[PDB]
């Protein structure tokens, strides 16, 4: 929204910059005017051949006589025109170079200054300014916004003015050559302009707004893959796949509809373009027959005006470029223009000598920039004598730290004054104040350089001797000297991570090199190990004795030796004095003291449809064959009119052409819509097949794969959408266009080649060169782009280091250091940006000059050698068209290149994800399917390590046995060991060693589905999909539809019926947060219902009461208790009071069963279980 | 500019 | 598509 003035943005351009911009925009306007002048001569050429074209055919008597005057006229005229063209070429060359080079130079020269000034301004901000702002946003703002600004003031301006110049010049020549055709075309201008803009909007659809139509399936996919363990447990995979398939089924239909409409639109647009284009020309001919216009003039004005018309369209984007740049420059300059109160880059104020370090805080009221919300310091009074050391203590609020905060003048106080020696702190220079004050902070930071440098960040001028004495006086010498590389060792976030105390000591050394008169120590001893604490404490004590010191910490071991101790309450200073006095006071201090004591294989998948392709390619080849027919006509339109001879026959002939001229148009509506519709419908179907085959195979994989940190629901849904979205683009429109373009160039080149002898062979030498010359330029553009990104990446890295740790660097000053380093970092990209302008200009001008010089060789060879022969102009005009547009059609091959690459990378994954097979597949029909109902469960010598974390074993030699119709209670110290039983019985994993049986058969050889079909699993936080609760209950049994009275019975067994009959919708109510909300109790009871609607022989209750409270636990436990006792059961629940009735209790220890037996037996014994029960039991009594 | 001629 | 650019 907010923007910037035009003159302020360029404030950093002076002297040579303005000159570059002037000469640049000048040369640009010249370059702009250059083109329409080309089309102006083109009419004069037509008149030359037209004058001879009429006279040559008018004779029909003498032959040789026509070999004299005509050839001479063509000689002088063609030579003149060619000379001019050659003249234009050098011009466009020079002016192009000047333009792009100068503008790029200006841009670079400015942006450099912008960056430097901006970073300086960033560093110049006071801390209060940072406290209210996001640093990440600010740095990213730097790096991105400066780039936007760069894009804005760049060569884009030259292009804009050049476009405006083509616009004006085109319309000038257009009007001056004649007024009528221009206005007619100006009636055409809105018509066509309305068509082309819409066409472009239709093409751009590939970016993702696609969610609106698709997301319906994505929702199913997400809740499924989020619920994967539940759908796995209940084996409802076929259903989920079905749902997803249905949603896809809808999606494809919406897709083909969109395809139809879009194709119709594009076709209609093309028709409008055709019709108008032809109509204007027909009116032109209608004007030529009246002898009001020359045949060439028509061409001149037509092309000049249309040029002028589209110039606008291609001009517009540069406006937005300059537009965005102002808006970006706003927030940038805001910081540069911002002048703070504190500065610290300022040289001003007193720099006192012989500071004794007498400090006093007088009546200081303060609040951080949370402002009125909280006032932390209400009044204050404090003094500290020179050479003394004061210790600040407090219960909370950290008003203690506030003093150290203010003493550096990071903030100026609301009311009151802090006074160092006799003078107000605000009278003395900031930098000097900061330099006379040393600081040691709780969390020490070390910038990434050698230790020496970090010690050198104390003072820029220092010798290794001072470093040595400094670290040795901090007693950090030993620890670092033992380290390799000596002082040259590396430190930072990345690499050489050291002990906190060591880092603190290095910090103290850095502070010690500062040789400060004033020392501020804030909780530097705190948040550190007790052993190294004394080591660092020695240093801290040794860091004093030359200085006055204010210290703050939570450890009262260091306070006793302080000269004065100061307590705070609610921001109010209260207790002050020596230790004994404060202990005699028995106040806050005493209180705290006492308190602390080549893949075509996917193309083979599209081979499902043999048709729908041949149609589109045949049609698109016919379109490819239809395209140059447009050029053949235009040739003969101007051709017969030039070759006319007697005029009488012309009017009818020109009129029959303009008819036909349109006839290829209307037929172009049929063919274009076809090849777009066949390829489109073909695109939406395989998108169903792929996503269906991808998703399916994703439900095949076991839990082992879903536990992978590499694969998460979002990543899977993303991988699911993208690849399927991408492969469509490669097999889609692009291919059709390529075939259309090769067919286009092919038919074009056949016609051209068979008509012009060596006229075409010539062009085929020229055209592939300028095309390849066009591609290589884009390659150099990306190379310089990537290389530049890498260099500023290094300069942006030192900025991030500076502004993220900023609150430290301000304390140490040396911001100027980072200024200098940042500059030296920038210096390399700067010299690089100078070469950029030199290159960008040459590559541009070379490509323009080649196209203009090529245009000279065109008519020069077309005339002279060819026209001196019996070969004719009408063919020349045909060939140039045909060939050049064959080329401009080939350009789309280069333009469409990356799609296949991206699609290949995306098509690489999508096959792999299908071809991947699991260890345990739920799809296999193999496995025993025993006939015997009664379950038991045998765990024997089981060892299990989770595939994700094969470090700490959960299970080692676990062995369990539980008979039918009896409850197995499972207790454990902690961990998934209790759950892993339930996970392994469901067979999400096969254990590393050992084995598990049910009826005595090994489940490993058993059918997986049949196995999971007999299990009653109920988890902690049951996930219910969005659908009727009856459908969530009916989810308990698949491959069969559940009866109403059955889910009723199951609902009755689960005691949820109170809710279900209470709801307005009853069993048809929707749950899962889309249509309704329920608490954990209802959800759980539903889980119970779906558990026992399955009628399992084995119930598995995994911490069912985990998240729950009050009566809910009671009723749910009642339900669960009612659910069991008729079945085999394994209950791991954390309430042991509810396990007191269990057939077998088993205490798990380190993966081995430790204690096992009935409650009273484990109670008779005194051991782990007794403790487990004793700790939680009577805790209710402790709660009383 | 789309493909026919504009 | 004749000579200017269409």
Return the HEC string of A381-405.
EEEECCCCEEEEEECCCCHHHHHHH
A269 → chain B, closest CA residue: B2
- Asked if A822 and A800 count as a contact pair (C-beta separation under 8 A), the reply is no
* Residue A1144: strand, helix, or coil: strand
Distance CA A838, CA A816 (A): 33
The residue written with tokens 């009871």 in the block is: A1085
| Closest C-chain CA to B2 | C6
Tell me which architecture the domain covering A349-597 has in CATH. 3-Layer(aba) Sandwich (3.40)
Decide if C1 and A303 are in contact by the 8 Å CB cutoff. no
Helix (H) or strand (E) holding A632: helix A629-642
CB of A881 within 8 A of CB of C3? Answer: yes
3-state helix, strand, coil in chain C (%, to 5): 0, 0, 100
- What are the CA-CA distances from residue A756 to residues A81, A629, A744 (Å)? 21, 16, 18
Q: Provide the experimental method for this PDB entry.
A: X-ray
Backbone angles phi, psi at A1131, to 5 degrees: -120, 115
- How far, in Å, CA of A574 to CA of A581, rounded? 13
Chains touching chain B, criterion 3+ CB pairs below 8 Å: A, C
Strands A993-997 and A1027-1028, sheet pairing: unpaired
**b/e code A290-325 from CB counts within 10 Å (16+ = b):** eeebbbbbbbbbbbbbbbbbbbebebeebeebbeeb
Residue A791 φ/ψ, nearest 5 degrees: -80, -45
* Chain C residues within an 8 Å CB radius of A307: 4-5
H or E element in which residue A572 lies:
strand A572-577
Angle between helices A873-895 and A629-642 in degrees, nearest 10: 160
- Sheet holding A1152-1157: strands in order across? A1098-1101, A1128-1131, A967-972, A1144-1149, A1152-1157
Among A625, A879, A622, CA closest to A753: A879
- CATH number of this structure's domain A927-1184, picked from the four choices 3.40.50.300, 3.30.413.10, 3.40.30.10, 1.20.1250.20: 3.40.50.300
Going by the DSSP 8-state scheme, the letter that residue A561 receives in this structure is T
What is the residue extent of each domain of chain A?
1-348+598-926, 349-597, 927-1184
CA distance A675 to A494: 56
DSSP conformation letters of A214-257: HHHHHHHHHHHHHSHHHHHHTT-HHHHHHHHHHHHHHHHHHHHH
Using a CB–CB cut-off of 8 Å, the residues of A that contact C are: 39, 42, 277, 299, 303-304, 306-307, 310, 630-631, 634, 877, 880-881, 884-885
Mutation pick from A44, A637, A881, A887 vs chain C, by most beta carbons of C within 10 Å, is A881
Q: How far is C1 from chain A (nearest CA, A)?
A: 6
Helix A614-626 / helix A629-642 crossing angle, nearest 10 deg: 20
User: What does the alpha-carbon distance between residue A330 and residue A213 come to, in Å, rounded to a whole number?
Assistant: 38
Closest CA to A1086 of A239, A234, A235, A240: A234
Classify domain A1-348+598-926 by CATH number: 1.20.1560.10
Q: Do C1 and A299 touch (CB under 8 A)?
A: no
In whole angstroms, how far apart are CA A751 and each of A279, A618, A631, A856, A880?
Answer: 26, 19, 10, 22, 11
- B3 vs A270: CB contact, 8 Å cut-off? yes
| Residue with token string 């051709």 | A639
Rounded Cα distance between A526 and A503, Å, is: 14
Residues A806/A138, Cβ–Cβ less than 8 Å = no
**B1 to chain A, closest Cα gap in Å:** 7
Are A140 and A332 a contacting pair, CB within 8 Å? no
Chain C from 1 to 6: CB within 8 A of any A CB: 1-6
| Gap between the Cα atoms of A258 and A960, Å rounded | 61
Domains A1-348+598-926 and A927-1184 share a fold: no
| Alpha-carbon separation of residue A259 from A264, A676, A678 (angstroms) | 8, 7, 9
Q: In this complex, do A313 and B1 lie within 8 Å of one another by their Cβ atoms?
A: yes
How are beta strands A1098-1101 and A1128-1131 bridged, if at all? parallel
């Amino acid at each position: 929204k907010p923007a910037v003035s035009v003159l302020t943005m360029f404030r950093y351009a002076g002297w040579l910059d303005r000159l570059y911009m002037l000469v640049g925009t000048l040369a640009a306007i010249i370059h702009g005017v250059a083109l329409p002048l080309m089309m102006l001569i083109f009419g004069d050429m037509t008149d030359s051949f037209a004058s001879v074209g009429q006279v040559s055919k008018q004779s029909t008597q003498m032959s040789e006589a026509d070999k004299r005057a005509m050839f001479a006229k063509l000689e002088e005229e063609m030579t003149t025109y060619a000379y001019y063209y050659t003249g234009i070429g050098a011009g466009v060359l020079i002016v192009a170079y000047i333009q792009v080079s100068f503008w790029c130079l200006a841009a670079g020269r400015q942006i450099h200054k912008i960056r430097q000034k901006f970073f300086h301004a960033i560093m110049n901000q006071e801390i209060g300014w940072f406290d209210v702002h996001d640093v990440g946003e600010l740095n990213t703002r730097l790096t991105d916004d400066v780039s936007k600004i760069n894009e804005g003031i760049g060569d884009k301006i030259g292009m804009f003015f050049q476009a405006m110049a083509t616009f004006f010049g085109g319309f000038i020549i257009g009007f001056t050559r004649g007024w009528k055709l221009t206005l007619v075309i100006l009636a055409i201008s809105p018509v066509l302009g309305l068509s082309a803009g819409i066409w472009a909007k239709i093409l751009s659809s590939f970016t993702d707004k696609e969610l609106h139509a698709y997301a319906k399936a994505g929702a199913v996919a997400e809740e499924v893959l989020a619920a994967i363990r539940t759908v796995i447990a209940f084996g409802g995979q076929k259903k989920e796949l079905e749902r997803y398939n249905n949603n896809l089924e809808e999606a494809k239909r919406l897709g083909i509809k969109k395809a139809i409409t879009a194709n119709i639109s594009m076709g209609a647009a093309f028709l409008l373009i055709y019709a108008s284009y032809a109509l204007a020309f027909w009116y032109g001919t209608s004007l030529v027959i009246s002898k009001e216009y020359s045949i060439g003039q028509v061409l001149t004005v037509f092309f000049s005006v249309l040029i002028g018309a589209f110039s606008v369209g291609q001009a517009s984007p540069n406006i937005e470029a300059f537009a965005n740049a102002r808006g970006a420059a706003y927030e940038v300059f805001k910081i540069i223009d911002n002048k703070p109160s504190i500065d610290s880059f300022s040289k001003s104020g007193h720099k006192p000598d012989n500071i004794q370090g007498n400090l006093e805080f007088k009546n200081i009221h303060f609040s951080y920039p949370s402002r009125k919300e909280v006032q932390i310091l209400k009044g204050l009074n404090l003094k500290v004598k020179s050479g003394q050391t004061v210790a600040l203590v407090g219960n909370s609020g950290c008003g203690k730290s506030t003093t150290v905060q203010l003493m550096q003048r990071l903030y100026d106080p609301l009311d009151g004054m802090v006074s160092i020696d006799g003078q107000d702190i605000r009278t003395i220079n900031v930098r000097y104040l900061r330099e006379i004050i040393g600081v040691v902070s709780q969390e020490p930071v070390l910038f990434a350089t050698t230790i020496a440098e970090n010690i050198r960040y104390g003072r820029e001028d220092v010798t290794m001797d001072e470093i040595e004495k400094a670290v040795k006086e901090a007693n950090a010498y030993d620890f670092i000297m033992k380290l390799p590389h000596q002082f040259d060792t590396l430190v930072g976030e990345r690499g050489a991570q050291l002990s906190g105390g060591q880092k603190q000591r290095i910090a103290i050394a850095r502070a010690l090199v500062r040789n400060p008169k004033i020392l501020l120590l804030d909780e530097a001893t705190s948040a550190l190990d007790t052993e190294s604490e004394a080591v660092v404490q020695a240093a801290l004590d040794k860091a004093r004795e030359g200085r006055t010191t204010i210290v703050i910490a939570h450890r009262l071991s260091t306070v006793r030796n302080a000269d004065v101790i100061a307590g705070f309450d609610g921001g109010v200073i209260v207790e002050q004095g020596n230790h004994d006095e404060l202990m005699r006071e028995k106040g806050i201090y005493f209180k705290l003291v006492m308190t602390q004591t080549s893949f075509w294989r996917i193309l083979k998948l599209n081979s499902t449809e043999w048709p729908y392709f041949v149609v589109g390619i045949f049609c698109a080849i016919i379109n490819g064959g239809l395209q140059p027919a447009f050029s053949v006509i235009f040739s003969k339109v101007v051709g017969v009119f030039t070759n006319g001879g007697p005029p009488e026959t012309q009017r009818q002939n020109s009129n029959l052409f303009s008819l036909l001229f349109l006839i290829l148009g209307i037929i172009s509506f049929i063919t274009f819509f076809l090849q777009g519709f066949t390829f489109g419908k073909a695109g939406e179907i395989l998108t169903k097949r792929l996503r269906y085959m991808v998703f399916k195979s994703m439900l095949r994989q076991d839990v082992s794969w879903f536990d992978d940190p590499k694969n998460t629901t979002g990543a899977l849904t993303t991988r699911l959408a993208n690849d399927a979205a991408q492969v469509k683009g490669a097999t889609g429109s692009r291919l059709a266009v390529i075939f259309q373009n090769i067919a286009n160039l092919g038919t074009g080149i056949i016609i051209s080649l068979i008509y012009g002898w060596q006229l075409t062979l010539l062009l085929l030498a020229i055209v592939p060169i300028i095309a390849i010359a066009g591609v290589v330029e884009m390659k150099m553009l990306s190379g310089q782009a990537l290389k530049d990104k890498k260099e500023l990446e290094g300069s942006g890295k030192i900025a991030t280091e500076a502004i993220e740790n900023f609150r430290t660097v301000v304390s140490l000053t040396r911001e100027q250091k980072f200024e200098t380093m940042y500059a030296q970092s920038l210096q390399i990209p700067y010299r690089n940006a100078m070469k950029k302008a030199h290159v960008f200009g040459i590559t541009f001008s070379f490509t323009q000059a080649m196209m203009y010089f090529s245009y000279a060789a065109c008519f020069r060879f077309g005339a002279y050698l060819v026209t001196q022969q019996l070969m004719t102009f009408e063919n020349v005009l045909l060939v140039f068209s045909a060939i050049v547009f064959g080329a401009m059609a080939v350009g789309q091959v280069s333009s469409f290149a990356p799609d296949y690459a991206k699609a290949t990378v995306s098509a690489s994954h999508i096959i792999r994800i299908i071809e991947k097979t699991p260890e345990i597949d739920s799809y296999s029909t193999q496995g025993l399917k025993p006939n015997m109902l009664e379950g038991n469960v045998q765990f024997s010598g089981v060892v299990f390590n989770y595939p994700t974390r094969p470090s700490i074993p959960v299970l080692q030699g676990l062995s369990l046995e539980v008979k039918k119709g009896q409850t197995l209670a499972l207790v454990g110290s902690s961990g998934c060991g209790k759950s892993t039983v339930v996970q392994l019985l469901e067979r999400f994993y096969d254990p590393m060693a050992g084995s598990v049986f049910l009826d005595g058969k090994e489940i490993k050889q058993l059918n997986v589905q049949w196995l999971r079909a007999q299990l009653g699993i109920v988890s902690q936080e049951p996930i219910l999909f969005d659908c009727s609760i009856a459908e969530n209950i009916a989810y308990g049994d698949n491959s069969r539809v559940v009866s109403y009275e059955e889910i009723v019975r199951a609902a009755k067994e689960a005691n949820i019926h109170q809710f279900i009959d209470s709801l307005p919708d009853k069993y048809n109510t929707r749950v899962g947060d889309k249509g309704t909300q329920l608490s954990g109790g209802q959800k759980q009871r539903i889980a119970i219902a779906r558990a026992l609607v399955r009628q399992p022989h084995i119930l598995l209750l995994d911490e069912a009461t985990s998240a729950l409270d009050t009566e809910s636990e009671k009723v749910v436990q009642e339900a669960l208790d009612k659910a069991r006792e008729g079945r085999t059961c394994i209950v791991i629940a954390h309430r042991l009071s509810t396990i007191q009735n269990a057939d077998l209790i088993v205490v798990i220890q380190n993966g081995k069963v430790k204690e096992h037996g009935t409650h009273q037996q484990l109670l008779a014994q005194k051991g782990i279980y007794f403790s487990m029960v004793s700790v939680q039991a009577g805790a209710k009594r402790s709660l009383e | 500019x789309a493909x026919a001629x504009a």
